[PDB]
């Protein structure tokens, strides 16, 4: 059963095993069961850890339900794949990726006075091809002041760095004037409309190029896994795979009583139903209850 | 879909575009008589303007019945399509069995016939492993778990470098 | 036997979801007993 904080996370979720846990919970509440009071407890560090591990139970069956657009031509399979992961972010409680990674910046650098310590605590989230181009330009503005460039904004020594880092950001290809004019806004709704149409033209060309770089790495991983496997004789392949299949079954049979190992071996019985339901009618496929 | 849709019997398709199925509607004032002809069968019913609006009240919401998952079957479909590009170049292999006769055995150098019989045994090694298509499903499970861990990002499932770089300039080139 | 369901057949199979649940069922009740008992 679910712990009533999982089932609040699975309401806007749309995978199968989470909706049938919701639907049997809503069928219990139709038969007069009391909805248990959700906890007004679990302080700021424990609340961010439950949100970390309940979002990952919405993301994990959702990622396995998104077909990769491997070996497709065009942007719309890559835009479908990116839109399904956007919607998986919203179903799991994430915001927009722009609003969720900039929250990661301002959280990791809450205590930063100099921008060299910004550029070292946001190292995991910024590309090293871009972290280096902001560190080389930093040491030139460090050469003009011969004092550490501050994370102040009011400082004029930062204002000449922010005009040099804007020259770096346009060199990568990303419009730093359009990005800044979106998250700041404007007064009228007509001049803010044209900059949102120009941010979302960058943003869609941004997240497509992250999805397409993810597809081009799965395509390159699968093509090197296959070409290594096609160089084996077929007798080696069948026993390398039967050794890997049997070792991975035994790890789920060593684990007794665990919920994951009970569900692992129950899905092995559901794959063998799929192979057996196809053998009865192969022009029809698997037989669904209809 | 959304909850309320607003299409049906207004700017509708009035005729089919292929020859495999023949479509005719009878645009009356209230209702419409459809004439559908597909193969040997014909159907001629009557659909109101408010009969198509109740169609999108209950949604179909199709979903895929996969053997393991939709992710895995999309990787295995790519390994099956990659294994075709290798099979198509084993289709272009020269028929070495046309040189198996003893008028090629005895004209040939005895070491260039060991190599010819080894290059024929090699083709059966390559061909019997490229048609081992039951091994492509376990190869797709070597791609899945490393991909699925990159999607368990603490930032976002759809985050990447280009977005997180472009959202650094909003963080850096704003004040503190 | 035959003809399972549709909502039984829409489940992704070898997802984690239950290692993530088994970890959070042994990390969240084990860390509430860390902040309730914490002095440096």
């Amino acid at each position: 059963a679910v712990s009533k904080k999982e089932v609040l996370y699975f309401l806007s979720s749309k995978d199968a095993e989470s909706s049938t846990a919701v639907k049997s919970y809503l069928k219990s509440l139709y038969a007069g069961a009391q909805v248990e009071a959700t906890e007004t407890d679990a302080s700021e560090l424990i609340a961010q850890l439950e949100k970390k591990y309940l979002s990952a139970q919405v993301v994990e069956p959702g990622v396995h339900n998104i077909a990769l657009p491997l070996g497709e031509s065009g942007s719309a399979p890559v835009k479908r794949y990116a839109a399904e992961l956007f919607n998986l972010g919203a179903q799991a409680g994430f915001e927009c990726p722009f609003i969720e990674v900039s929250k990661k910046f301002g959280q990791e650098t809450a205590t930063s006075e100099t921008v060299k310590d910004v550029l070292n605590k946001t190292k995991s989230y910024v590309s090293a091809d871009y972290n280096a181009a902001l560190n080389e330009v930093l040491s030139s503005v460090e050469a003009e002041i011969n004092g550490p460039v501050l994370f102040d904004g009011k400082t004029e020594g930062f204002k000449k760095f922010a005009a040099k880092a804007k020259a770096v950001a346009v060199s990568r290809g990303l419009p730093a004037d359009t990005i800044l004019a979106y998250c700041a806004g404007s007064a009228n709704e007509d001049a803010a409309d044209k900059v949102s149409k120009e941010f979302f033209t960058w943003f869609e060309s941004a997240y497509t190029a992250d999805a397409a770089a993810e597809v081009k790495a799965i395509e390159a991983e699968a093509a090197s896994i296959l070409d290594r496997h096609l160089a084996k004789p077929v007798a080696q392949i069948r026993k390398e795979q039967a050794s890997a299949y049997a070792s991975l079954l035994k790890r789920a049979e060593t684990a007794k009583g665990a919920k994951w190992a009970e569900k692992y071996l129950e899905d092995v019985k559901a794959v063998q139903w799929f192979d057996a339901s196809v053998a009865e009618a192969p022009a029809s496929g698997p037989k669904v209850a209809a | 879909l959304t909850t309320f849709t607003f299409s049906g019997l207004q700017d509708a398709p009035v005729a089919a575009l292929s020859g495999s199925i023949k479509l005719n509607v009878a645009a009356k004032a209230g209702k419409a008589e459809v004439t559908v002809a597909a193969g040997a069968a014909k159907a001629a019913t009557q659909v109101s303007a408010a009969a198509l609006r109740k169609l999108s009240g209950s949604k179909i919401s199709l979903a895929e019945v996969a053997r393991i998952s939709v992710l895995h079957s999309s990787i295995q479909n790519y390994l099956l399509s990659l294994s075709n590009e290798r099979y198509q170049l084993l289709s272009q292999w020269p028929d070495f069995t046309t040189m198996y006769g003893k008028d090629f055995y005895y004209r040939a150098h005895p070491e260039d016939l060991k190599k010819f019989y080894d290059a024929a045994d090699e083709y059966y090694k390559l061909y019997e492993t490229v048609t081992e298509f039951d091994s492509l499903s376990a190869l797709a499970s070597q791609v899945v778990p490393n991909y699925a861990a990159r999607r368990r990002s603490t930032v976002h499932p759809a985050i990447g470098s280009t977005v997180a770089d472009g959202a650094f300039t909003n963080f850096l080139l704003s004040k503190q | 036997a035959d003809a399972k369901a549709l909502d039984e057949l829409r489940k992704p199979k070898f997802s984690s979801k239950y290692l993530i649940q088994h970890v959070s069922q042994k990390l969240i009740p084990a860390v509430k007993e860390w902040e309730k008992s914490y002095q440096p």
């Binding site: 910024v126 770089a213 | 797709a140 | -």
Partner: peptide, 30 residues
């Protein structure tokens, strides 16, 4: 066909490590 179950998160936002082209099309053309 079954995979090892992993429960670990990705903290870095990196490039996805495009692997190198194997020479199997060039080896089999040889």
């Amino acid at each position: 066909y079954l995979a090892p179950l992993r429960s670990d998160f990705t903290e870095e936002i990196t490039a996805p490590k495009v692997a190198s082209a194997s020479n199997l099309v060039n080896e089999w053309n040889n």
